[PDB]
Structure 1
Amino acid sequence: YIKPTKVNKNENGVVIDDKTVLAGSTNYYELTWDLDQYKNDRSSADTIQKGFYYVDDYPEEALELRQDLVKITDANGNEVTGVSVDNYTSLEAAPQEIRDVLSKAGIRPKGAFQIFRADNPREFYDTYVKTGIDLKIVSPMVVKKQMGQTGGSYENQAYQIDFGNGYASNIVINNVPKINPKKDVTLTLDPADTNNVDGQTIPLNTVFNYRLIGGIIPANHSEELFEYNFYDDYDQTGDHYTGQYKVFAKVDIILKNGVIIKSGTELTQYTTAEVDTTKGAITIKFKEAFLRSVSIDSAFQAESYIQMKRIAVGTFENTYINTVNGVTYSSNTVKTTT
């Protein structure tokens, strides 16, 4: 059976079809150009001249192209030359040549799409088609930051067009988690206590905590965590950072080696803090090697407690930024009175 096939992979070449993919992650889409049914073909010149194209109809509202990382290899491992790639923002913008090929093949891409085109049909034919050598196209596409603000699902589909005939690939679907960091104000540490004093008043010179709750990274995700930070530029005219902070697991976490770390476990040992005393700021950073030791199948979430002393009267606000794999996500803003 002639079948162009499409599979999504992470940067380590693991298959990630149906996995949760974080904003900022790359989909290393691998497109198969299925030519193995044409072995020994001996078509006319007119027929060969109808050309060979491949189409990827990618979801442009969710993903951005990484053009430069596009690679085409033949089944014998030779890199493929003679195939050029063009990205079109809409059908309306494609040349007539392209609109006609697509129309006569019964292919109508939704929104934006890529075309891979054999520059010389005769030569492409003689090289890969009459010999039935399948090609592999890798066309990496990054999930836009915005998908991480809204959550959502996206799908990708390809077509191959041989002698002007179109064949559709399977459709690959993934989804993106809405990362929503939260910020509470608490009077005690101890994660079990759900008390939140956002809005209330704090007596002058009270030692308290800002509770910085990280975004939830769901199980079955597509790549390794390498960064998970809590950045807090607090108002030092109101709040004095006391130099004390702790970090806790907020869901059960499973490592690559099978070791489990229960929700509530203190994770401070796997962190450092970058402190900027003049600016009045602190960044709590998970060590990259710890994050990377976590299984891609595991859920992951953590929360930091920074200990503050209220040192003046007035109304003071605070906000923090949770940075996950290079993408920033802001929390709500708390406000207390003194």
Structure 2
Amino acid sequence: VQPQVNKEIRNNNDINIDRTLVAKQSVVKFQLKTADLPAGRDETTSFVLVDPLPSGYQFNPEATKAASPGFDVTYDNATNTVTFKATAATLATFNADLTKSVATIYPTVVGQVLNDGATYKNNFTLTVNDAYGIKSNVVRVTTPGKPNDPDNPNNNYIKPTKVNKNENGVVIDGKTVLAGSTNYYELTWDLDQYKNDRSSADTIQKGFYYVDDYPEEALELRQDLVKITDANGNEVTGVSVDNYTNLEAAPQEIRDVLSKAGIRPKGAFQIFRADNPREFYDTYVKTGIDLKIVSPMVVKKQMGQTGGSYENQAYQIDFGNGYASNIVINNVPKINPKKDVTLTLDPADTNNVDGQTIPLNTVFNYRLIGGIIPANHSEELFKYNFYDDYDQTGDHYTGQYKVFAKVDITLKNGVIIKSGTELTQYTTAEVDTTKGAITIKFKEAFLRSVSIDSAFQAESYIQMKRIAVGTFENTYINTVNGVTYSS
């Protein structure tokens, strides 16, 4: 039990990190120190230290040789073990005077920790004059991403999350979203597992970013509504945000970050940047305070013509490492208005006279079927109008009209308006005799009483009198919330 040995583990700035936390890809150093050799010691013929480096610890031959003057460094890549042998020069010093005790020099293993949520344990062995050895104490350090970490109570999985909500805070993931509506996306910068992190300066300078890969074909950003707040409800000011249509069209700096994180957007994307890496680090990262980003995005009007699916996903890049969030999907309903020409004013009757020549002075009806708003939608109905621009040369608006439910409508109070029910009393009409047009509008009140889980569809009949012999056409435009749909 002669020279006691002692291993120490420090980060790239020499801070003792034993039993603490450090970022993935962080440089971790091993100091294999030994106590001063006593007086009466035999000449030291051999001084060997053997370190079986831990799993997932990448050895850096170059740096350790540089950081281990006085020792010949050898490495067994096969067993990931490194060996240090005191040079001839170094030994002479251990023998300069045996009658006295002499302090020693120590080797330093330099390398990086490569895995998330892993524990890296370490000890080394000292053998002197191939006669006796001492196994050293074990030291350790963990990386973020490991729940139930007895050393870092706040540690857990690194996982950003994304969620879609409507204006009233209701979660609308997977639901149908009317064209023109807004997606109030809530992104979470998952920072809690970083609490009490002891990473070095180089590591903290690899920056902090948050990316949102948004469907640029279906949505357009409303970056003016972007809002960033932390877990404590306070506004965040150190984060700037920008967007690019595609990697190539982005600042070389951004391409490099996204590249080293293994993140490759599908086209255009929104990226958030921490302006002062250090300030951000001391304020939110090592304090474990999660950030909340709200990035509203509106569904382009053309989506309502074609219909279709659009999905959203985010990423967060901490200390240069990237992590992806869950994917949120929504689909847009294809609002398809239709008009028919009928002699009856009964929702029941399916007979029409489409394409049939109508006799002079015939009182008929234009059946204006509104677009269908599918069940399980995301926002309330605030506008549902039928607009008809008839040809005054051929048709004279009679002055009468009726409106009917085309599907079973459900109210927020549970009442089910059975399909085919007259609903005229919830509408109003403003006619422009001059130009030859008419507009039937539902009362906003009534529309907002319909449950958002309910399907909705109406149709109206506008009585017309044929004042001239001939074939005339008409434009019927159905308006649903903030978008108009023709035909």
Displacement after TM superposition at 1:245 (Å): 0.4
Distance in 2, matches of 1:51 and 1:26, equals 31
1:175 pairs, out of 312, 315, 331, with: 331
Task: List 4+ stretches of structure 1 deviating above 3 A.
Answer: none
Distance in 2, matches of 1:167 and 1:327, equals 37
- SS across alignment from 1:208: strand
What residue is the counterpart of 2:440 in the other structure?
284
Distance in 2, matches of 1:38 and 1:196, equals 69
Distance in 2, matches of 1:115 and 1:319, equals 44
Q: Is the Cα contact below 8 Å between 2:175 and 2:376 reproduced in 1?
A: yes
Distance in 1, matches of 2:240 and 2:445, equals 40
Displacement after TM superposition at 1:4 (Å): 0.3
Displacement after TM superposition at 1:260 (Å): 1.0
1:106 pairs, out of 247, 262, 266, with: 262
Displacement after TM superposition at 1:199 (Å): 0.6
- SS across alignment from 1:323: strand
Displacement after TM superposition at 1:53 (Å): 0.1
- SS across alignment from 1:69: coil
What residue is the counterpart of 2:372 in the other structure?
216
Distance in 2, matches of 1:206 and 1:31, equals 61
Distance in 1, matches of 2:353 and 2:243, equals 52
Deviation string, structure 1 residues 174-199 (Cα, Å, up to 9, x no partner): 00000000000000011111112121
Is 1:268 the counterpart of 2:416 in the alignment? no
Displacement after TM superposition at 1:280 (Å): 1.0
Distance in 1, matches of 2:459 and 2:471, equals 25
Distance in 1, matches of 2:312 and 2:485, equals 26
What residue is the counterpart of 1:250 in the other structure?
406
- SS across alignment from 2:247: coil
Count how many residue pairs are aligned between Structure 1 and Structure 2: 331
Deviation string, structure 1 residues 239-260 (Cα, Å, up to 9, x no partner): 1111100000000000111111
Q: Is the Cα contact below 8 Å between 2:177 and 2:333 reproduced in 1?
A: yes
- SS across alignment from 2:435: coil
What percentage of residue pairs aligned between the two structures are identical?
99
- SS across alignment from 1:7: strand
Deviation string, structure 1 residues 212-238 (Cα, Å, up to 9, x no partner): 000000000000000000001111111
Distance in 1, matches of 2:353 and 2:372, equals 23
Displacement after TM superposition at 1:2 (Å): 1.4
Distance in 1, matches of 2:437 and 2:262, equals 58
Distance in 1, matches of 2:280 and 2:380, equals 39
Distance in 1, matches of 2:385 and 2:187, equals 35
Displacement after TM superposition at 1:315 (Å): 1.4
- Which of the pair has the greater relative contact order for Cα pairs under 8 Å at 6+ separation? 1
- SS across alignment from 1:122: helix
Displacement after TM superposition at 1:266 (Å): 0.3
Distance in 2, matches of 1:35 and 1:166, equals 13
- SS across alignment from 2:165: coil
Distance in 1, matches of 2:267 and 2:430, equals 44
Distance in 2, matches of 1:30 and 1:37, equals 20
Q: Is the Cα contact below 8 Å between 2:181 and 2:482 reproduced in 1?
A: no
- SS across alignment from 1:315: coil
For structure 2, the residue ranges without an aligned partner over 5 or more in a row are: 1-156
TM-score (norm 1): 0.97
Q: Is the Cα contact below 8 Å between 2:342 and 2:351 reproduced in 1?
A: yes
Displacement after TM superposition at 1:51 (Å): 0.5
